[PDB]
C-alpha cells in the first residue's frame, strides 16, 4: 500500500513551493514535523526534506542517480516514498547520529480537505468570501483599537511627566516656606517687641498667600493623578479588547488560507479569487 | 505647548516670583520680555513687599523654574524671552547661582538637541549606563585630536568634507560625454564690496586637482615664465566653492570624482565654481573646545566552563496581565535560549494556569550544558494566552529578552524582575528574539519575576587565551591539518558554489557538515565566512572555540559582505568585531553615508551599550560633519521609542558633547521642526472641521509672528546641511490636500551665487504619516541607480531627498518643474503631446530617450521592491522627459496579508499612454523598434540588480528591528528573493520577469517571439 504510492499523491510532497512557504508551515511546530519540496532549480539535487529538530528547521537534500535516491553516496532507496517511509519508522541517527529523530508528523497538502468538507467550487468560494469579510472586519476593529492604544500611551506619558513637574513645583514652593520660616523667626521675634503689628500683618499676609498657592498646586497635581488613573485603566481595557481579538484573527486568517488553498487546487481562475476576496 | 496646556500666552500675564527673603511677588509681565527686563520689573515692585532691606542687586541673582520636561532649569542666558523658556507653570524663583556655569549651559543645549534632560542619565542606577557615559568619552577626545592634528586644514575638512564618490575611475559612458576627456567649467570671482560678479571660463582635464583648477583661473597680457612664481606662492591663497552651496573642494581629489562635478556632466550643465580666499574660510571656522564633563570578604570568582550543571531558570509569577477571564482560557510563560534568531535548545513552556492567577513557581529545565552556552546567548520569553473540536490559538500578551551574560561577561544569577514590552503590530510569533534586551522602563507594565541559578559569587565567561587552549585540545581528539590533507578539485568547486548562495538561502545539513569538515580550507575563499558561521554548532563550546581561532586570523572581506555579519543572525562579539574591522579598513566616507540608515539600525541588535560598531560610527560622525549630521537625525527621529530611548539618548549626548559648533546649528534645526510639529498638531486637532482657506489664514498669522520668523529662517536644511534655508517666501507656503495636512514650505537660498544653482528651496513638511518606508525605498533607488551607472546602463532615476525626523514626522525634497500624470491627462495621446510641446524642436529625441530610460528603471525597481500600486497621482513627469515616482507608502508587498494572494504583482503597469510616448506617437506602440529596445533596457537592468542581490538582502536584514511593519521578519525580506528569482537560474529569472510583465500587461508586453513575418 505505502511504498507503491506515487510521489505526486504523497501527502508530504508539495512540489515547487518556495523555501519560505515551507518555513511558514514549520514555524514553531513540534520535533518530527516535516515535508518535502522540489530543490532549487539552480542547485544540485532533486528534492529537499525539511524537518524540525531542537526548535529548528533542518534541510536535507535528496539526490538521484540511476534509479536510486539518498542523502549521500551510496544512493540506496528505490524511490522518495521509500526513503521517507523508512525514516517515518526509523531514526535519522542511522544517517547522522547528530539528529536522532523520526519523521513523525507530515504536513499534509490534503489538510484543508479535512476542514473544508464541501465539494462544490462556488460553495467553497462563497465561504472564502464570508471568512475574508469577517477577517477584514476584525482586522479593522483591531487597527482602530491599536490606534487608540498608541494615542493613549502618548497621553499617559505626557501626564506622567506633568506629575513630575508638579512634584518639582511643590518641592520648590515647599522650600520657600522653609526659607520664610528661617528668616521670619529672627525678624518677627524682634518686631513683636516695639509693638509693630503692621509688620507682622504684612509678613503673615504674604506667608498665607504662599500657603494659599501651595494648596492650589497640590490640588492641581491631585486632579491630574485621578485623570492618570482613569486613562491608565482605559489603556489596560484597550489592551484586554485587543487580546480577545488576536486569537479570533489568527483562526480567521488560517481558515481563510485553507479555503484559498482548496481553490488553488482544482485550478480556479485568479479573477474568481479576487472577486471573492 | 510652551506653557502647560497652552500653545502660547498673551503678552500680559502674571508670574509668581519667589524671592530669597521668603516673599512671593505676583508680577505683571510681558511675554516678549527677556529675563533681566522681568528682573527689572520684579525688583522695582519688590520695594513694596516686606524685607526689601534684605535683597542684593539684580546682577547678584538668577531665575530658576520647572520646565515641560520636569527639569529644575537655571536660566543663565538672560536674553532668552519668556515663551522660549518652556515653563511648566508661570513662576520664577531667584537664587544665588552655584556650580559650573559653562557646564550647565552646555547640558541644557545638549538636552534641547536630544529631546530629554541630561540629568535623567545621572539617575540611572544601571552600571552599564554609567560606564558607557564615562568610557565613550575616549572616542570623543580621540576624535577631536584627529581633526586638530594637521590644523587648520583638518579643521576645515571636518566642517566641509569633500563630497566625493568612492572611486576615481570614471565609467566609459561618463567619460564619452566629455569633449576629448575635458570639461568646460566656469570659475566666478567677486570684485569687492560692489559685488558686480565676474567669470573666468576654463577648459581643463577632468582629473585636475583643485590646485590645478585654481592655477588655470589666474591665467584666464603679462609675462609667461613668471607664472611659476604665483602658482607656487599663491596656490594656498584660494580654495574652490560650489555656487549656491556650502560645499568646498578642499582635498586633492580628481575634479570628476566630486559629486557635483559628476552630476554636472550627466545633466549637461555648466559647473559653476566660485573662487574664494582660503584665509576667509579658515579664520571663519569656530576652533571649538571639547571639555570633559563632571561625570568623568573576597569575591569567589569562577569560570563558566567549571560549572558541571545543566541550564535551568525559575519562572515565579507575573504581577498582572490584561486579559478578559471570560474569553481567554489559560495563560503560561513561553521561554527560549537563543543565539540571535536560532534556538540553542528546545523552547520550554511553564504549566498552564488561570488568567486571574499568573503564578507558576517552577524550574524550567533546558537540554543544554552550562559550559556550552555561547557568549551571545539570550533568554527570550513571553506571557502567552490560550483560547480553545479540540483546537486552540496561542497569542503573545507581552514579551522580553535578557542577556545570559552581562556587559562584563558575568553570567546572570538569582532573582530578577523583567517588565515586559507590548507585542509589535503584526507579530503573531509567540517569542520576539529580534527585539531589544533589558527591562521596560515604564513600571506600570506586566512584570515577570524569575530566578536564575546561583553557583558562585561571580561566574565569568573565559578569556580568549583559555578558549584557544580548549580549541587546540578539541581538535586533537577529533581524528596543521589545514595542509595535512589536500583540498580536492571536486571539494574546491562545491565550496565556491556554496559561497555564491545569497544570505537567506539556507545551507543544507550536508552542506553544514561539508563546510565544517573543510573549515581550515575555507580561509582561501574568505567570502564564505557567513556560510561557515551558519555551519557551526553554536550550542557546543568545542566547535565555537575552534571558530574563534579561525575568525582571529580571517582575511578581511569587502564592506558590503561584512554588513551581512552585522544583522541579527550573527550576534557573536568576535564575528561582529571582525565585521567592524572590515569597515574600519575598507569603508569609505561616501559608502558610510550611503549605508548610514542601516548601520544606525544595527545598534538595536547589539547586546550592550558599549561595542565596537558604536565606537566606529561615533568616531566617523565626529570626524565628518556630513556623517555626523545624519547620524544625529537618524538617532533623534526614534527618541520617542522607549525600546531605544536610553541607548540613542546616551549616544546622542556623546555626539553633542564632542561635535563642537554644529550643536548650535542642530539646535536651530530642532527648534524649527518643533515649531512646525506644534502648528501641524493644532491644525489636526483644533482646526479639523475648518476649511483649507481658514487653516491657511491661521497658519499665515502664526507664521508671521517674530518668534516663528526667527526660528523658521536662517538655518540649515535637515535634508542637506549644505543647503542653507534663508527667509521664508511665506506668501507661497501652502497646506497640501492630504488628510494629515502637509506643509509645502518655501525658503530663499541666501547664497551670494544662488541664481546659478537655485534661488529658492522647496520642502514638504509632513506630520501624520510614517516616512521611514519612503526614506528606505528612496535610498534603495539611489543604490540601484549607482549599480546601473557603473555597469554602463544610463537609466536615470530620481531619488529625491527624504528624511524621517521624528515619530511619523519627516521632510521631502520638492523636485522643480515636476507634474503628475493626472494633471497632464485631465485620450491616450495627451501625455506624448505634452512632452512634445515641452521639448518641441530638435531636442525631442533626447527627451523621449530620457523618458524611456526613466520608465525602464522605475519599471524594474518597483517590480523588485513590490511598492504600492502606481496610479496617475503617484507617477510624475518633468519638463525634460524624466519620469519618476512618489509616495511609495509600503513595500515588499505588505498588503499580501489582509488578502489571500501569494502572487508577485507589478506596481507600475505601462498603460497605452506611456507606450505611445516610448514609440514616438506610433499606433501599434507594443511592436515598434523603440519598445523592443525599451524591453532590453528593462532586462539588462533586472539582471544587474540580481547580480548585486546580496547587498539589498543585507541592507533589509539590518532593518528588521526598526519597528517598521513591512520589515518584521526574514519572511518579509524574502519577497525580493522571489522577484529577483534567486533560487532560479539567471536565464530562468529572465523568463520569470518576462512572464510577470506579460501577465500584468494583458498580452501587451511582447514576448521574445517577435514576428519579422
Ligand atoms: N506621502 C508622500 C510621500 C512622498 O515621498 C512624496 C509625496 C508627494 N511628493 C510630491 N513631490 C513634490 C515634487 O518633488 C517630489 C515630491 C508631491 S506633489 C503633489 C503631491 C506630492 N506628494 C507624498
Swiss-Prot record, chain A:
Coiled-coil region(s) = none
Found, by tissue, as follows:
Isoform 2 is expressed in skeletal muscle and brain, and at lower levels in kidney and cardiac muscle. Isoform 2 and isoform 4 are present in skeletal muscle (at protein level).
Summarizing the function annotation, the protein's role is: Binds to activated (phosphorylated) protein-Tyr kinases, through its SH2 domain, and acts as an adapter, mediating the association of the p110 catalytic unit to the plasma membrane. Necessary for the insulin-stimulated increase in glucose uptake and glycogen synthesis in insulin-sensitive tissues. Plays an important role in signaling in response to FGFR1, FGFR2, FGFR3, FGFR4, KITLG/SCF, KIT, PDGFRA and PDGFRB. Likewise, plays a role in ITGB2 signaling.
| Residues recorded as bearing Phosphotyrosine in the entry | 146, 259
Domain SH2 positions: 12-107
Q: What assembly does the database describe for this protein? A: Heterodimer of a regulatory subunit PIK3R1 and a p110 catalytic subunit (PIK3CA, PIK3CB or PIK3CD). Interacts (via SH2 domains) with CCDC88A/GIV (tyrosine-phosphorylated form); the interaction enables recruitment of PIK3R1 to the EGFR receptor, enhancing PI3K activity and cell migration. Interacts (via SH2 domain) with CSF1R (tyrosine phosphorylated). Interacts with PIK3R2; the interaction is dissociated in an insulin-dependent manner.
Q: Record's domain comment?
A: The SH3 domain mediates the binding to CBLB, and to HIV-1 Nef.
Q: Which residues of the full protein are shown?
A: 322 to 598 of 724
What is the name listed in the Swiss-Prot or TrEMBL entry for this protein? Phosphatidylinositol 3-kinase regulatory subunit alpha
> Membrane-spanning regions, if any?
none
The record's similarity note reads:
Belongs to the PI3K p85 subunit family.
Give the linked disease: Agammaglobulinemia 7, autosomal recessive: A primary immunodeficiency characterized by profoundly low or absent serum antibodies and low or absent circulating B-cells due to an early block of B-cell development. Affected individuals develop severe infections in the first years of life. SHORT syndrome: A rare, multisystem disease characterized by short stature, anomalies of the anterior chamber of the eye, characteristic facial features such as triangular facies, lack of facial fat, and hypoplastic nasal alae with overhanging columella, partial lipodystrophy, hernias, hyperextensibility, and delayed dentition. The clinical phenotype can include insulin resistance, nephrocalcinosis, and hearing deficits. Developmental milestones and cognition are normal.
Post-translational changes noted in the entry:
Polyubiquitinated in T-cells by CBLB; which does not promote proteasomal degradation but impairs association with CD28 and CD3Z upon T-cell activation. In adipose tissue, polyubiquitinated by the BCR(KBTBD2) E3 ubiquitin ligase complex; recognized by KBTBD2 through the SH2 domains, undergoes 'Lys-48'-linked polyubiquitination leading to its degradation.
From Swiss-Prot, chain B:
Pfam families, sorted: PI3_PI4_kinase, PI3K_C2, PI3K_p85B, PI3K_rbd, PI3Ka
Q: What is the effect of changing residue 428 to Q?
A: In CRC; likely involved in disease pathogenesis; shows an increase in lipid kinase activity; may disrupt the interaction of the C2 PI3K-type domain with the iSH2 region of the p85 regulatory subunit
| Pathway annotation | Phospholipid metabolism; phosphatidylinositol phosphate biosynthesis
Q: Which SUPFAM superfamilies match?
A: ARM repeat, C2 domain (Calcium/lipid-binding domain, CaLB), Protein kinase-like (PK-like), Ubiquitin-like
One GO term of the cellular component aspect?
intercalated disc
Q: What is the effect of changing residue 997 to I?
A: In MCAP and CRC; also found in an endometrial carcinoma sample; shows an increase in lipid kinase activity
Its recorded reaction(s) are:
a 1,2-diacyl-sn-glycero-3-phospho-(1D-myo-inositol-4,5-bisphosphate) + ATP = a 1,2-diacyl-sn-glycero-3-phospho-(1D-myo-inositol-3,4,5-trisphosphate) + ADP + H(+); a 1,2-diacyl-sn-glycero-3-phospho-(1D-myo-inositol) + ATP = a 1,2-diacyl-sn-glycero-3-phospho-(1D-myo-inositol-3-phosphate) + ADP + H(+); L-seryl-[protein] + ATP = O-phospho-L-seryl-[protein] + ADP + H(+); 1,2-dioctanoyl-sn-glycero-3-phospho-(1D-myo-inositol-4,5-bisphosphate) + ATP = 1,2-dioctanoyl-sn-glycero-3-phospho-(1D-myo-inositol-3,4,5-trisphosphate) + ADP + H(+)
Q: Which GO terms describe its biological process?
A: actin cytoskeleton organization; adipose tissue development; angiogenesis; anoikis; autosome genomic imprinting; cardiac muscle cell contraction; cardiac muscle contraction; cell migration
Q: Where is this region: Activation loop?
A: 885-911
Q: What positions belong to coiled-coil segments?
A: none
Which Enzyme Commission number(s) are on file for it?
Answer: 2.7.1.137, 2.7.1.153, 2.7.11.1
Lineage, top-rank taxon, reads Eukaryota
- Consequence recorded when altering residue 975 to N: Found in a glioblastoma multiforme sample; uncertain significance
Summarizing the annotation, the consequence of altering residue 105 to N is: In MCAP; increased phosphatidylinositol 3-kinase signaling; decreased interaction with p85 regulatory subunit; no effect on protein abundance
PROSITE patterns the UniProt entry points to: C2_PI3K (PS51547), PI3_4_KINASE_1 (PS00915), PI3_4_KINASE_2 (PS00916), PI3_4_KINASE_3 (PS50290), PI3K_ABD (PS51544), PI3K_RBD (PS51546), PIK_HELICAL (PS51545)
Note the SMART domains from the entry: PI3K_C2, PI3K_p85B, PI3K_rbd, PI3Ka, PI3Kc
Q: Which residues form the C2 PI3K-type domain?
A: 307-462
Q: Where is the site Implicated in the recognition of ATP as well as PIP2. Also crucial for autophosphorylation of the p85alpha subunit?
A: 740
Known outcome of mutating residue 81 to Q: In MCAP; also found in a glioblastoma multiforme sample
Per UniProt, residues of the PI3K-RBD domain are 180-277
This molecule's function is given as: Phosphoinositide-3-kinase (PI3K) phosphorylates phosphatidylinositol (PI) and its phosphorylated derivatives at position 3 of the inositol ring to produce 3-phosphoinositides. Uses ATP and PtdIns(4,5)P2 (phosphatidylinositol 4,5-bisphosphate) to generate phosphatidylinositol 3,4,5-trisphosphate (PIP3). PIP3 plays a key role by recruiting PH domain-containing proteins to the membrane, including AKT1 and PDPK1, activating signaling cascades involved in cell growth, survival, proliferation, motility and morphology. Participates in cellular signaling in response to various growth factors.
Q: What else is known?
A: The avian sarcoma virus 16 genome encodes an oncogene derived from PIK3CA.
Amino acid at each position: 500500500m505505502n511504498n507503491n504510492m506515487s510521489l505526486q499523491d504523497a501527502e508530504w510532497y508539495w512540489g515547487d513551493i518556495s523555501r519560505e512557504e515551507v518555513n511558514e508551515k514549520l514555524r514553531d511546530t513540534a520535533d518530527g514535523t516535516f515535508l518535502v519540496r522540489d530543490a532549487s532549480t539552480k542547485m544540485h539535487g532533486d528534492y529537499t526534506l525539511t524537518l524540525r529538530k531542537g526548535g529548528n528547521n533542518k534541510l536535507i537534500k535528496i539526490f538521484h542517480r540511476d534509479g536510486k535516491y539518498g542523502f549521500s553516496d551510496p544512493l540506496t532507496f528505490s524511490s522518495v516514498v521509500e526513503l521517507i517511509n523508512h525514516y517515518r519508522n526509523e531514526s535519522l541517527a542511522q544517517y547522522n547520529p547528530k539528529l536522532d529523530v523520526k519523521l513523525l508528523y507530515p504536513v499534509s497538502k490534503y489538510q484543508q480537505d479535512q476542514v473544508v468538507k464541501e465539494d462544490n467550487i462556488e460553495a467553497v468560494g462563497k465561504k472564502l468570501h464570508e471568512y475574508n469579510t469577517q477577517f477584514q472586519e476584525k482586522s479593522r476593529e483591531y487597527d482602530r483599537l491599536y490606534e487608540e492604544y498608541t494615542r493613549t500611551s502618548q497621553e499617559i506619558q505626557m501626564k506622567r511627566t506633568a506629575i513630575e513637574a508638579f512634584n518639582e513645583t511643590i518641592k520648590i514652593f515647599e522650600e520657600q516656606c522653609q526659607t520664610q520660616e528661617r528668616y521670619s523667626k529672627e525678624y518677627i521675634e524682634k518686631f513683636k517687641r516695639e509693638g509693630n503689628e503692621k509688620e507682622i500683618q504684612r509678613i503673615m499676609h504674604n506667608y498665607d498667600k504662599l500657603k494659599s498657592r501651595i494648596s492650589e498646586i497640590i490640588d492641581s497635581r491631585r486632579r491630574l493623578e485621578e485623570d492618570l488613573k482613569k486613562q491608565a485603566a482605559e489603556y489596560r481595557e484597550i489592551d484586554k479588547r485587543m487580546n480577545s481579538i488576536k486569537p479570533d484573527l489568527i483562526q480567521l486568517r488560517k481558515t481563510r488560507d485553507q479555503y484559498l488553498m482548496w481553490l488553488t487546487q482544482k485550478g480556479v481562475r485568479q479573477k474568481k479569487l479576487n472577486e471573492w476576496l | 505647548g510652551e506653557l502647560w496646556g497652552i500653545h502660547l500666552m498673551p503678552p500680559r500675564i502674571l508670574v509668581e516670583c519667589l524671592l530669597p527673603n521668603g516673599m512671593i511677588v505676583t508680577l505683571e509681565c510681558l511675554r516678549e520680555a527677556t529675563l533681566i527686563t522681568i528682573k527689572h520689573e520684579l525688583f522695582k515692585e519688590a520695594r513694596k513687599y516686606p524685607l526689601h532691606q534684605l535683597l542684593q542687586d539684580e546682577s547678584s541673582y538668577i531665575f530658576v523654574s520647572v520646565t515641560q520636561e520636569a527639569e529644575r532649569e537655571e536660566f543663565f542666558d538672560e536674553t532668552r524671552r519668556l515663551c522660549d523658556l518652556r515653563l511648566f507653570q508661570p513662576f520664577l524663583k531667584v537664587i544665588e547661582p552655584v556650580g559650573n556655569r559653562e557646564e550647565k549651559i552646555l547640558n541644557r543645549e545638549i538636552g534641547f538637541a536630544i529631546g530629554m534632560p541630561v540629568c535623567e542619565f545621572d539617575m540611572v542606577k544601571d552600571p552599564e549606563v554609567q560606564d558607557f557615559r564615562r568610557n565613550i568619552l575616549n572616542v570623543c577626545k580621540e576624535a577631536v585630536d584627529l581633526r586638530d592634528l594637521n590644523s587648520p586644514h583638518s579643521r576645515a575638512m571636518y566642517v566641509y568634507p569633500p563630497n566625493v564618490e568612492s572611486s576615481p575611475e570614471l565609467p566609459k559612458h561618463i567619460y564619452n560625454k566629455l569633449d576629448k576627456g575635458q570639461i568646460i567649467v566656469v570659475i566666478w570671482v567677486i570684485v569687492s564690496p560692489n559685488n558686480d560678479k565676474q567669470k573666468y571660463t576654463l577648459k581643463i582635464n577632468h582629473d585636475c586637482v583643485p590646485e590645478q583648477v585654481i592655477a588655470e583661473a589666474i591665467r584666464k597680457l603679462l609675462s609667461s615664465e613668471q607664472l611659476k612664481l604665483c602658482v607656487l606662492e599663491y596656490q594656498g591663497k584660494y580654495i574652490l566653492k560650489v555656487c549656491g552651496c556650502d560645499e568646498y573642494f578642499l582635498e586633492k581629489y580628481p575634479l570628476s570624482q566630486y559629486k557635483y562635478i559628476r552630476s554636472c556632466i550627466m545633466l549637461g550643465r555648466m559647473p559653476n565654481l566660485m573662487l574664494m580666499a582660503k584665509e576667509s574660510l579658515y579664520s571663519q571656522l569656530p576652533m571649538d573646545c571639547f571639555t570633559m564633563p563632571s561625570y568623568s570578604g573576597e569575591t569567589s570568582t569562577k569560570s563558566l566552563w567549571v560549572i558541571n550543571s545543566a541550564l535551568r531558570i525559575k519562572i515565579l509569577c507575573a504581577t498582572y496581565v490584561n486579559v478578559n477571564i471570560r474569553d481567554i482560557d489559560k495563560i503560561y510563560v513561553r521561554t527560549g535560549i537563543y543565539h540571535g534568531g536560532e534556538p540553542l535548545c528546545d523552547n520550554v513552556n511553564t504549566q498552564r494556569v488561570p488568567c486571574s492567577n499568573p503564578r507558576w513557581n517552577e524550574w524550567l529545565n533546558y537540554d543544554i550544558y552550562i559550559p556550552d552556552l555561547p557568549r551571545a546567548a539570550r533568554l527570550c520569553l513571553s506571557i502567552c494566552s490560550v483560547k480553545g473540536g479540540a483546537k486552540e490559538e496561542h497569542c503573545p500578551l507581552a514579551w522580553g529578552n535578557i542577556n545570559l551574560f552581562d556587559y562584563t561577561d558575568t553570567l546572570v544569577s538569582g532573582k530578577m524582575a523583567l517588565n515586559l514590552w507590548p507585542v509589535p503590530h503584526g507579530l503573531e510569533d509567540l517569542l520576539n528574539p529580534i527585539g531589544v534586551t533589558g527591562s521596560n522602563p515604564n513600571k506600570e507594565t506586566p512584570c515577570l519575576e524569575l530566578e536564575f541559578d546561583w553557583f558562585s559569587s561571580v561566574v565569568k565567561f573565559p578569556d580568549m587565551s583559555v578558549i584557544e587552549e580548549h580549541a587546540n585540545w578539541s581538535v586533537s581528539r577529533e581524528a596543521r591539518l589545514a595542509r595535512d590533507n589536500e583540498l580536492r578539485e571536486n571539494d574546491k568547486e562545491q565550496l565556491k558554489a556554496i559561497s555564491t548562495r545569497d544570505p537567506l538561502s539556507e545551507i543544507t545539513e550536508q552542506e553544514k557538515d561539508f563546510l565544517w569538515s573543510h573549515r581550515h580550507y575555507c580561509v582561501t575563499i574568505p567570502e564564505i565566512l557567513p556560510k561557515l558561521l551558519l555551519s557551526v554548532k553554536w550550542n557546543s563550546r568545542d566547535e565555537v572555540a575552534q571558530m574563534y581561532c579561525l575568525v582571529k586570523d580571517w582575511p578581511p572581506i569587502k564592506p558590503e559582505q561584512a554588513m551581512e555579519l552585522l544583522d541579527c543572525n550573527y550576534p557573536d562579539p568576535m564575528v561582529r568585531g571582525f565585521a567592524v574591522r572590515c569597515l574600519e579598513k575598507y569603508l569609505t566616507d561616501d559608502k558610510l553615508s550611503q549605508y548610514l540608515i542601516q548601520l544606525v539600525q544595527v545598534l538595536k541588535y547589539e547586546q550592550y551599550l558599549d561595542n565596537l560598531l558604536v565606537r566606529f560610527l561615533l568616531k566617523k560622525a565626529l570626524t565628518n560633519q556630513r556623517i555626523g549630521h545624519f547620524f544625529f537625525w537618524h538617532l533623534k527621529s526614534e527618541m520617542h521609542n522607549k525600546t531605544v530611548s536610553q541607548r540613542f539618548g546616551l549616544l546622542l549626548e556623546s555626539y553633542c558633547r564632542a561635535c563642537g559648533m554644529y550643536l548650535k546649528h542642530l539646535n536651530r534645526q530642532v527648534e524649527a521642526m518643533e515649531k512646525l510639529i506644534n502648528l501641524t498638531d493644532i491644525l489636526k486637532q483644533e482646526k479639523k472641521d475648518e476649511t483649507q482657506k481658514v487653516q491657511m489664514k491661521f497658519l499665515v498669522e502664526q507664521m508671521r509672528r517674530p518668534d516663528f520668523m526667527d526660528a523658521l529662517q536662517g538655518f540649515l536644511s535637515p535634508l542637506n546641511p549644505a543647503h542653507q534655508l534663508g527667509n521664508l517666501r511665506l506668501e507661497e507656503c501652502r497646506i497640501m490636500s492630504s488628510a494629515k495636512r502637509p506643509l509645502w514650505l518655501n525658503w530663499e537660498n541666501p547664497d551670494i551665487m544662488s541664481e546659478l544653482l537655485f534661488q529658492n528651496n522647496e520642502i514638504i513638511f509632513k506630520n501624520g504619516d510614517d516616512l521611514r518606508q519612503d526614506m528606505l525605498t528612496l535610498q534603495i533607488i539611489r543604490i540601484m541607480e549607482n549599480i546601473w551607472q557603473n555597469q554602463g546602463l544610463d537609466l536615470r532615476m530620481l531619488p529625491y531627498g527624504c528624511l524621517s525626523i521624528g515619530d511619523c514626522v519627516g521632510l521631502i525634497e520638492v523636485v522643480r518643474n515636476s507634474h503628475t500624470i493626472m494633471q497632464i491627462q485631465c485620450n491616450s495621446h495627451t501625455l506624448h503631446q505634452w512632452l512634445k510641446d515641452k521639448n518641441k524642436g530638435e531636442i525631442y529625441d533626447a527627451a523621449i530617450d530620457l523618458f524611456t530610460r526613466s520608465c525602464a528603471g522605475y519599471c524594474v525597481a518597483t517590480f523588485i521592491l513590490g511598492i504600492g500600486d502606481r496610479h496617475n497621482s503617484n507617477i510624475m513627469v518633468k519638463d525634460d522627459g524624466q519620469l519618476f515616482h512618489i509616495d511609495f507608502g509600503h513595500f515588499l508587498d505588505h498588503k499580501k496579508k489582509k488578502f489571500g494572494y501569494k502572487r508577485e504583482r507589478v506596481p507600475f503597469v505601462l498603460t497605452q499612454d506611456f507606450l505611445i510616448v516610448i514609440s514616438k506617437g506610433a499606433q501599434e506602440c507594443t511592436k515598434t523598434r523603440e519598445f523592443e529596445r525599451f524591453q532590453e533596457m528593462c532586462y539588462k537592468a533586472y539582471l544587474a540588480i540580481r547580480q548585486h542581490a546580496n547587498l539589498f538582502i543585507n541592507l533589509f536584514s539590518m532593518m528588521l528591528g526598526s519597528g517598521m511593519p513591512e520589515l518584521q521578519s526574514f519572511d518579509d525580506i524574502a519577497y525580493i528573493r522571489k522577484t529577483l528569482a534567486l533560487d532560479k537560474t539567471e536565464q530562468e529569472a529572465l523568463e520569470y520577469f518576462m512572464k510577470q510583465m506579460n501577465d500584468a500587461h494583458h498580452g501587451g508586453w511582447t514576448t521574445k517571439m517577435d514576428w519579422i513575418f
